[PDB]
Amino acid sequence: DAICSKANELLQRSRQVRESLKEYQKISNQVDLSNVCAQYRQVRFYEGVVELSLTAAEKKDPQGLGLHFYKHGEPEE
């Protein structure tokens, strides 16, 4: 929440103008990231953003739970 707001600000300062990028990496998580992502791109940060997205994906899951889900591929839990 508040942390998220801080993150947006973190990037926002970075929008104005390496360090802020790092600060973002620390914060990265969830849906708000979508909006935040557009911001990363503004200063041509495509490459870092992908690892960012990927790391986040792994961070929530750790780990390999989804793979099991696919194996069954069941609609059940």
Plain-language structure description:
By secondary structure, the chain is mostly helical. The protein is 75% helix and 0% strand. It has helices at 2-16, 19-27, 32-42, 46-60, 65-72. α1 (2-16) packs antiparallel against α2 (19-27). The radius of gyration is 15 Å and the shape is elongated. The PDB classes it as transport protein. Keywords: Nuclear Pore Complex, NPC, transport protein.
- Rg, Cα atoms, Å: 15 Å
What pattern of helices and strands is seen along the backbone?
A: HHHHH
Determine the number of helices (DSSP H or I, runs of at least 4 residues): 5
Question: What is the helical fraction, as a range of percent?
Answer: over 70%
Family: Belongs to the non-repetitive/WGA-negative nucleoporin family.
Subunit structure: Interacts with GLE1. Able to form a heterotrimer with GLE1 and NUP42 in vitro. Forms a complex with NUP35, NUP93, NUP205 and lamin B.
Protein name: Nuclear pore complex protein Nup155
Organism: Homo sapiens
Defining traits:
1 chains, part of a larger assembly, mainly alpha, Nuclear pore complex protein Nup155, 0% strand, 75% helix, 77 residues
